[PDB]
Amino acid sequence: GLASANVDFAFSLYKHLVALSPKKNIFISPVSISMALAMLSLGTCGHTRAQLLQGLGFNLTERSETEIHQGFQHLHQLFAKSDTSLEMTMGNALFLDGSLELLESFSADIKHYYESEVLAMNFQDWATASRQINSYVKNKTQGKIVDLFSGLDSPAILVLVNYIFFKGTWTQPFDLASTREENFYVDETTVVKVPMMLQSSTISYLHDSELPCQLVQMNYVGNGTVFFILPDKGKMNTVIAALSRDTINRWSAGLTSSQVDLYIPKVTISGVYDLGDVLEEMGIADLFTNQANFSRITQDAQLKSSKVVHKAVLQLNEEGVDTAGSTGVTLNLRKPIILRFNQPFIIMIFDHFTWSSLFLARVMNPV
Numbered sequence: 255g256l257a258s259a260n261v262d263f264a265f266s267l268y269k270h271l272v273a274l275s276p277k278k279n280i281f282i283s284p285v286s287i288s289m290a291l292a293m294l295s296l297g298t299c300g301h302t303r304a305q306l307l308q309g310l311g312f313n314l315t316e317r318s319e320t321e322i323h324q325g326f327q328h329l330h331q332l333f334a335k336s337d338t339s340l341e342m343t344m345g346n347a348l349f350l351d352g353s354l355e356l357l358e359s360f361s362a363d364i365k366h367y368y369e370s371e372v373l374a375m376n377f378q379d380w381a382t383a384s385r386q387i388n389s390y391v392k393n394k395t396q397g398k399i400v401d402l403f404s405g406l407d408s409p410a411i412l413v414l415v416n417y418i419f420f421k422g423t424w425t426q427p428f429d430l431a432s433t434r435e436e437n438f439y440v441d442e443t444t445v446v447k448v449p450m451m452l453q454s455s456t457i458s459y460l461h462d463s464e465l466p467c468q469l470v471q472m473n474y475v476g477n478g479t480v481f482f483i484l485p486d487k488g489k490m491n492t493v494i495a496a497l498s499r500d501t502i503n504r505w506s507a508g509l510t511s512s513q514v515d516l517y518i519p520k521v522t523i524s525g526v527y528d529l530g531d532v533l534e535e536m537g538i539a540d541l542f543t544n545q546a547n548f549s550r551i552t553q554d555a556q557l558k559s560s561k562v563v564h565k566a567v568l569q570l571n572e573e574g575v576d577t578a579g580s581t582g583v584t585l586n587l588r589k590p591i592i593l594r595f596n597q598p599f600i601i602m603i604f605d606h607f608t609w610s611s612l613f614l615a616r617v618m619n620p621v
């Protein structure tokens with residue numbers, strides 16, 4: 255199923271990304287990356303197609319591709335539904351150079367399954383081109399995601415874009431008057447001052463006995479839900495390595511209503527990731543080679559993928575969360591329990607309804 259494959263991609267992408275930069279704050283939106291690369295797969299063939307879909311985790315021996323795109327159409331559709339549009343939006347776009355014309359079926363497919371806009375662009379003028387697209391993404395994410403492509407790209411004739419924006423409200427908001435500056439212990443040799451939020455509430459709590467960590471689950475107004483995982487000091491990678499469907503399943507069953515003095519910091523983090531190295535570690539490599547099969551994009555031209563970029567922002571306050579994420583792919587011609595989050599921790603934001611991993615975080619430093 256889609257929900258299982260997507261989250262396994264989420265955790266796998268997360269684990270691999272964690273290993274590449276062990277001191278940086280890590281914040282990503284897995285569903286954005288999965289929908290974008292799946293939309294890209296519509297224009298791929300041969301070994302490139304098979305390798306991509308397999309990297310996203312779908313078994314193309316027990317599952318058709320139409321089913322997959324039918325699967326992402328269903329999610330894209332559900333993240334439009336009236337009761338979630340106010341708090342969540344997701345969308346796709348295709349930017350195309352005038353020298354190229356899409357095959358009827360490709361442009362028809364991206365419009366049917368992904369509701370993608372296809373917009374003409376003059377890529378010969380890349381300064382203008384990255385300006386048009388960055389603002390487009392800027393606007394679609396209400397200004398949270400700024401300058402997605404940056405000046406350090408060689409020009410490219412096709413750009414596939416996906417964006418996600420999410421604004422949730424705590425069912426149990428933190429106490430506004432209670433926020434104070436506390437110590438957040440970043441390393442054994444690095445200490446920072448951070449705004450620490452506080453609430454004393456009945457909260458879902460679990461001290462894990464099989465893993466060196468403690469965790470809480472909080473819901474948002476709507477269908478949003480979030481996990482906060484605090485590993486024991488120096489056990490961050492043991493908890494990350496254990497992140498799977500089986501662990502969160504075991505956690506959900508273990509979470510019990512408890513009295514908690516909950517201290518979480520006001521996190522404002524962002525991250526920019528070239529997912530080239532990350533994706534090829536996951537086995538998605540043919541896209542970038544001069545043997546790339548993009549024959550379903552257009553009739554005549556050989557296309558390869560030049561760049562895959564993800565950008566995401568996180569804001570945490572007493573009232574809620576404000577998150578945004580974007581992926582782009584460039585193609586070229588071939589008694590109360592005291593729980594204190596004053597050290598590195600994990601954030602996992604999910605949707606109760608679809609189980610889509612919306613946002614994953616490794617907070618090394620919350621400032």
Ligand SMILES: C[C@]12CCC(=O)C=C1CC[C@@H]1[C@@H]2[C@@H](O)C[C@@]2(C)[C@H]1CC[C@]2(O)C(=O)CO
Pocket residue numbers: 255257258261479499500502503506604605606609610
């Ligand atoms: C592994 C699980 C169930 C089987 C599956 O194919 C995929 C997933 C990924 C998301 C998990 C889900 C269930 O376990 C319940 C979870 C943890 C959910 C994310 C949010 C959670 O729904 C809950 O909030 C339940 O309280």
